[PDB]
Amino acid sequence: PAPHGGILQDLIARDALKKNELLSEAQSSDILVWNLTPRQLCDIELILNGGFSPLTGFLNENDYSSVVTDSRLADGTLWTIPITLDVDEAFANQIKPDTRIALFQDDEIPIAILTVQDVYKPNKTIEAEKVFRGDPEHPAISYLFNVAGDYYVGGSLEAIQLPQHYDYPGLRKTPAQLRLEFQSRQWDRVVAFQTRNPMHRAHRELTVRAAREANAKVLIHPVVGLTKPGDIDHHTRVRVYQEIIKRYPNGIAFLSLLPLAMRMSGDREAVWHAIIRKNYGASHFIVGRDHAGPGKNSKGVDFYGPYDAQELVESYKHELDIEVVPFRMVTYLPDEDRYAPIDQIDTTKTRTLNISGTELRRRLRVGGEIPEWFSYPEVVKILRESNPPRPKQGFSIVLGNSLTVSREQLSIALLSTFLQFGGGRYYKIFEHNNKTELLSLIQDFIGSGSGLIIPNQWEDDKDSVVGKQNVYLLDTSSSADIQLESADEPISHIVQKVVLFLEDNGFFVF
Amino acid sequence: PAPHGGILQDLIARDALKKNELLSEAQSSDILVWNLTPRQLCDIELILNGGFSPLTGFLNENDYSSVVTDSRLADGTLWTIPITLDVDEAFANQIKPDTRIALFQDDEIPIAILTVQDVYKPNKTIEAEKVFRGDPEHPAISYLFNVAGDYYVGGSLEAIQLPQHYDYPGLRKTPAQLRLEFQSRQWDRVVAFQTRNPMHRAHRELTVRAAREANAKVLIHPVVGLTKPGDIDHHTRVRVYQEIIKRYPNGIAFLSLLPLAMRMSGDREAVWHAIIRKNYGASHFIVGRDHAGPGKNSKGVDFYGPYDAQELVESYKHELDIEVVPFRMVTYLPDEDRYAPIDQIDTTKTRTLNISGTELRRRLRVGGEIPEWFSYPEVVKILRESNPPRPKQGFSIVLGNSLTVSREQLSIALLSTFLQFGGGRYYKIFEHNNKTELLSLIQDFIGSGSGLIIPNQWEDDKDSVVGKQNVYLLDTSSSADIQLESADEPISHIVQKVVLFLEDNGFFVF
């Protein structure tokens, strides 16, 4: 179908003969410069290549406001997610309309020149409530208040080049490129599948049903920009994707990576995804259970209904101009050894089985087996590879402040003890001396699979610098992970407590 | 580099706005029509897409002649293999210069409109001797005299569409497309690897050395048009290729199928391959041992020297305008467990190992093991899949004419006997009654893995219709595959002879 708004806004193509000129300007000693943030680099690349058509810059207050209260651009164009350039008060204060800002990447690569139309200070609470449903634990809300700048700069863009990427070089097809791909193959019907997690049996089956129902070819269009904190990294996923694509019949599917920065905005996000996929050349778009939803909040309540997205997309049906292929919870049927939409089976006279993400995360962490029927073995292998079981995980033991025994001697004792176990883990007594340049390495080591013995705590002001994962506190404090009986407890006693704790948590296996 | 001649002759692009017009003409009740042969469909697709640049139609006598005696087109452009439209006397007699012929595919799809320049009757002997070196067993020479028409029709072409293909739809990149592929990835150095056989360890290693030596990305450009009779089918090969490509480091290689019709013209063919690859956008081209050679003739003598191609290519070096990466026999080194060019090892103080094609063909036919070091297991699996060991092969037993026992009873006896063995083969008493519509099916069954019991021989005039593979003759004749003692030999005796014969040839395994 035609790109949203009718015109593919490929600004790279549009501004081709301005490149050298824009480049010079971007590099002049007088232009205002802003180094794009990660999500901003994700958004600007979708703007510059026509993925966010009709958009051609970041939303101004008028357009932004309409999107928030209307799910539409000022002119009425259906648009649910606000795309804005958030900056800080400092930078904002140097901006005036008509001003031209050079937007860089990594403070080195000139991406584009923004021509300021306005500088406003959004009410983050309204955006939070109206666009993301207001739950503070919601990924987009947390980002909004904790990472996003407090001042938005609206304005038109002029392309210099798309953000640089050294991985998966040929796979990040642009709307124009993908459209050309489908064309060279004479694909006039393509159903797109959005995804931010690895694909298992259910997915393969559901995407194939879609291809069969829609009579269209399959586009696995995974998100590699930004997703939900805690998601499997995109590299591990691209591998999972390239592997699973070999399970489809020869010539039915195409893989293309989408550098989109998700918002986990359930239903609004689905409407947005459909618009994006249409721009990219898809004729059909899959919207399954809890599309783009972030699950439940700590209280166990749903951020979005399991089918809110489907319903919203359905209400915008005649406007989207792209066909939606809805799916009900696709589950496993033991007795018939096959998958199928829950709405097609009698959950009364037929038994179903389902390994949830939580459940999977768990197996991977304990080294537990994952059913042959759940996912393909190569997929699981790749997952295990980058999400190793506890006996392969790294960790850190911190000698609490309450500790009264010799920290040096307790450290050595723990070191020598861990060493005798053997098995491949690297151990080290890591003194940070409160230097953040060191504190910031604690997780690099844990991430490398190493066991670190830390002689003492770090200032509370520096706590943010350290990634809490697999970091355990040894102390008499009630809030210690490994609680000591008393600050003067004999070393050997402490060592056994720590060993058994780590063994109880899968780090050690004898 | 620039395409040969300087201009990419993508006639599909050139004649885009003529398509509807050419189409109408091609489909008029008055235009002369010729349905392209297989190799002709191979050649015309390389002409229409700029692969044979500078060519823009089939060679006329002037150009043809110069290519034969000069390895150059009339204007001097380096060109070693003659590309002509060979027709029969009947068709030829209706052609006059200025005439326009509609060239169809499968008598249904209009490919192009040829504007006749001349109609000549080539001296096949000269072409055989001068271009293919005159050995009658040479693949190109046999085709020349046994398949090629005796009259060549030279003339310019006007594109309607490239030949239709329903398999590997997106993989058959055109020069322009490939060039666009390399570009979108910013590949300014690409070394192309030609191939018509499956790729094993040696190949992967040799193409990687090339990539490293040349400082260029890898293009696996296999031939899927026409190769040498007896080669592994291209489908099996594409699978082998798609699998082996996964053994290269991420992002270093690209796979694109070339619908070229090989000539197995050793050195001349190599020069031609380099020109073709240059047109397709390559900056480097690999030329290894016996490039494009058909091996030895039945007498055991070489059609070309193991490095004739390398030497010819080298002599045209400053003309080819594409860098050649020559390789000496790449062999295996047991003790160092690695491959390397023979010219880099001391064949005196180091042992080498090599499983030749013949040797491989043999293992595959006996179900023999293929060294882990020779090829990758997935590749070998795919090969075995379409080149099954004897116990899975089909065959046919023919009751010779000399036979004097009851043909009906001997047939049944052989049928019931084979049946008791079990094992999965399908058996049938196949009566052909000399009807070619039936004789032509004999190989389809053998190909399907079935065992056919044929009650009697077929007329000699019909012999050509039958594929001699796995077709054994039971007769008293000295020239019988399973020789009987006498035409009246008792059935049970004959049955044992046949059983033991088939068991001795791997068809039966107990």
Ligand SMILES: Nc1ncnc2c1ncn2[C@@H]1O[C@H](COP(=O)(O)OP(=O)(O)O)[C@@H](O)[C@H]1O
């Ligand atoms: N078991 C399932 N039943 C129905 N739909 C599913 C199922 N699993 C995944 N989907 C759908 O597949 C798509 C991508 O899945 P996933 O990556 O987990 O979520 P997200 O929408 O956040 O990308 C979504 O449309 C989702 O609703």
Ligand SMILES: Nc1ncnc2c1ncn2[C@@H]1O[C@H](COP(=O)(O)OP(=O)(O)O)[C@@H](O)[C@H]1O
């Ligand atoms: N062992 C080897 N050492 C060096 N080059 C090789 C070796 N095997 C194959 N090659 C080269 O690989 C390319 C393709 O191989 P193949 O398909 O067998 O022959 P062809 O040249 O007929 O396409 C050729 O350039 C050939 O010379």
Ligand SMILES: [Ca+2]
């Ligand atoms: Ca704030």
Ligand SMILES: [Ca+2]
């Ligand atoms: Ca629920």
Ligand SMILES: [Ca+2]
């Ligand atoms: Ca005490």
Ligand SMILES: [Ca+2]
């Ligand atoms: Ca003849």
Ligand SMILES: [Ca+2]
């Ligand atoms: Ca030889």
Ligand SMILES: [Ca+2]
């Ligand atoms: Ca007798």
Ligand SMILES: [Mg+2]
């Ligand atoms: Mg980028």
Ligand SMILES: [Mg+2]
């Ligand atoms: Mg989900």
Ligand SMILES: [Mg+2]
């Ligand atoms: Mg074709």
Ligand SMILES: [Mg+2]
């Ligand atoms: Mg060879």
Ligand code: NA
């Ligand atoms: Na439309």
Ligand code: NA
């Ligand atoms: Na810098």
Ligand code: NA
């Ligand atoms: Na709801």
Ligand code: NA
């Ligand atoms: Na519409």
